[PDB]
Structure 1
Amino acid sequence: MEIAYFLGCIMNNRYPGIEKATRVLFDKLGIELKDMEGASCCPAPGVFGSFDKTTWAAIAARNITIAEDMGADIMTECNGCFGSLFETNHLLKEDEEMKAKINEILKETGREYKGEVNVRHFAEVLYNDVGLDKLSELVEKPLNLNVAVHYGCHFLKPSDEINIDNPERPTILDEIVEVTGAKSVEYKDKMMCCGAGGGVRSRDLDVALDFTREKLTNMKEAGVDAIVNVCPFCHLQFDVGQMEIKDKFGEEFDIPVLHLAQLLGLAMGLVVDAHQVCVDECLEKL
């Protein structure tokens, strides 16, 4: 099938390995990814939603109109971008006054929002449109890895609108991980935030790094080889905040951070040089 592909900022501007692994995986699955030419920031919900709702909604709607013109659903492999675009989409679908205001704003750009497309998440597409049996077929390398799955806040919440899985005790990402042969390890406060969302990372790096330090402490207590996430924002937090924690508190955690696409690429046959935490030991442990 076909699906519009939204990149965001971090994945295409800081971690191209995620993009490369996703592209390779999705042609291996007979799904065509169509680029959304001219796409911009989702925009990042934390700052723009906090400063002005109209600007955030207008930019997100302009991004959605690209996929609408392409006549395909948007697919996102970022919790932040998925949250922003999903919220904008159904907010504009479920009311007309906000849609009218956003369309009046977009008129100057020559675009019109129609609400004829759906926003979908990488992991949800893999679970539903592909299936666990279809992905088990493409594992050439059973992996030997104790993995700490980080769901992220905006993958499943607010669950009243998303309806993908249970926010408290989800299983979807654990099943997708265990498809590859890696073992998902339960650790304390698994569903806790990484600390990057909501703009906190840009306003108080100490608080965000405290969030990250707490989960890294729990993760290390659980004895996990790597962290697997579905958000470039969470990826960047877990990757750069580890070095920041080392620089500030001298607290050493060396747990490589992997996107779900990269983990699926390790089984099945990564631009790890972009990662601030070396992944070489983890690969050698395989």
Structure 2
Amino acid sequence: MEIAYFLGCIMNNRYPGIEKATRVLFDKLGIELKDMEGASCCPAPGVFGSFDKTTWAAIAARNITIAEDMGADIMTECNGCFGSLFETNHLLKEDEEMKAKINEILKETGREYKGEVNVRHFAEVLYNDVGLDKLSELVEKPLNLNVAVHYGCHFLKPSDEINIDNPERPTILDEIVEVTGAKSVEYKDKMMCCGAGGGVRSRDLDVALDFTREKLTNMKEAGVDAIVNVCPFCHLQFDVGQMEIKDKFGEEFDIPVLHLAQLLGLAMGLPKEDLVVDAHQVCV
């Protein structure tokens, strides 16, 4: 199997360990990751979708046309990038005049959007294409960890279009986490936003940090050992906002932040160097 590999911005520019773990895991699983040469920001929905819909859609359409020229479906392991690309794909597929406008914009770049590929999430690919049995067969050593799973808002919502899992009480990420031996611990307001989406992190950092602080308080009384996410935008929010909260209000949350790929690599016995925990501001 071959699938186009979209990196985004945060994973490849602040936390390359997630990218390394994903590459190693997908090489082990027998899936070829094809690089989307010349890809750019998806662009992050929070700012670009809020400022100008046409520009956001055009940039996302160019990103999609890269994968269309390679023949493959796009795989992304970021909730924000998945949301942006997936939303642009269904809009253009089910909207001919918008498609014509986007193609008129794209003509100057020597590209044309054809609506020929699908946008897929890393977790969804792991759950469906691979299955839990194959993932279990690859676990070299079970983990002894209590983890708080952060689904992120844009993994499963809007659920009418995505149709991956129930957005109120999902279980997909919990199952993928638990095949590793880690225990997915329930905590209050588990499905709450991290506060980074919609451009809020850069508009009002205090509000986003309040989101993150409420989530961290709930996770801490749940008595968890780590946070598992499938969004580099949530990953960065948690990791950097823990220290920001430490400096601002002095509250000391010392919960490591791990991407699902990093947790799978830990359960698969990958080298400690490949996880690149040095990029994390919260020590793992």
| TM-score where L is the length of structure 2 | 0.98
Cα shift at 1:168: 0.2
Check if 1:82 corresponds to 2:60. no
Check if 1:133 corresponds to 2:133. yes
Figure out how many residues of one structure are paired with residues of the other and give that number: 279
Cα shift at 1:105: 0.2
Cα shift at 1:235: 0.1
Looking at structure 1, the residues matched to 123 and 14 of structure 2 have their Cα atoms a distance apart, in angstroms, of 21
Looking at structure 2, the residues matched to 227 and 202 of structure 1 have their Cα atoms a distance apart, in angstroms, of 22
RMSD: 0.2
Looking at structure 1, the residues matched to 220 and 268 of structure 2 have their Cα atoms a distance apart, in angstroms, of 27
Looking at structure 2, the residues matched to 217 and 111 of structure 1 have their Cα atoms a distance apart, in angstroms, of 48
Cα shift at 1:258: 0.1
Looking at structure 1, the residues matched to 115 and 90 of structure 2 have their Cα atoms a distance apart, in angstroms, of 8
Cα shift at 1:19: 0.1
Aligned equivalent of 1:275: 280
Q: Look up the SS of the partner of 1:140 in the other structure.
A: coil
Q: Can you list the C-alpha shifts for 1:110-164, whole angstroms capped at 9, x where unaligned?
A: 0000000000000000000000000000001110000000000000000000000
Cα shift at 1:13: 0.1
Q: Can you list the C-alpha shifts for 1:9-29, whole angstroms capped at 9, x where unaligned?
A: 000000000000000000100
| % identity of equivalent residues | 100
Cα shift at 1:5: 0.1
Looking at structure 1, the residues matched to 140 and 89 of structure 2 have their Cα atoms a distance apart, in angstroms, of 38
Cα shift at 1:63: 0.3
Q: Can you list the C-alpha shifts for 1:22-58, whole angstroms capped at 9, x where unaligned?
A: 0000010000000000000000000000000000000
Aligned equivalent of 1:54: 54
Cα shift at 1:203: 0.4
Q: Look up the SS of the partner of 1:4 in the other structure.
A: strand
Cα shift at 1:92: 0.1
Cα shift at 1:264: 0.1
Looking at structure 2, the residues matched to 181 and 126 of structure 1 have their Cα atoms a distance apart, in angstroms, of 17
Q: Can you list the C-alpha shifts for 1:64-105, whole angstroms capped at 9, x where unaligned?
A: 000000000000000000000000000000010000000000
Q: Can you list the C-alpha shifts for 1:150-194, whole angstroms capped at 9, x where unaligned?
A: 000000000000000000000000000000000000000000000
Looking at structure 1, the residues matched to 42 and 221 of structure 2 have their Cα atoms a distance apart, in angstroms, of 36
Which runs of 5 or more residues in structure 2 are unaligned? Answer: 270-274
Aligned equivalent of 1:19: 19
Q: Look up the SS of the partner of 1:149 in the other structure.
A: strand
Looking at structure 2, the residues matched to 211 and 268 of structure 1 have their Cα atoms a distance apart, in angstroms, of 33
Q: Look up the SS of the partner of 1:66 in the other structure.
A: helix
Q: Look up the SS of the partner of 1:116 in the other structure.
A: coil
Looking at structure 2, the residues matched to 144 and 173 of structure 1 have their Cα atoms a distance apart, in angstroms, of 17
Aligned equivalent of 2:220: 220
Looking at structure 1, the residues matched to 248 and 133 of structure 2 have their Cα atoms a distance apart, in angstroms, of 45
Which runs of 5 or more residues in structure 1 are unaligned? Answer: 280-286
Q: Look up the SS of the partner of 1:157 in the other structure.
A: coil
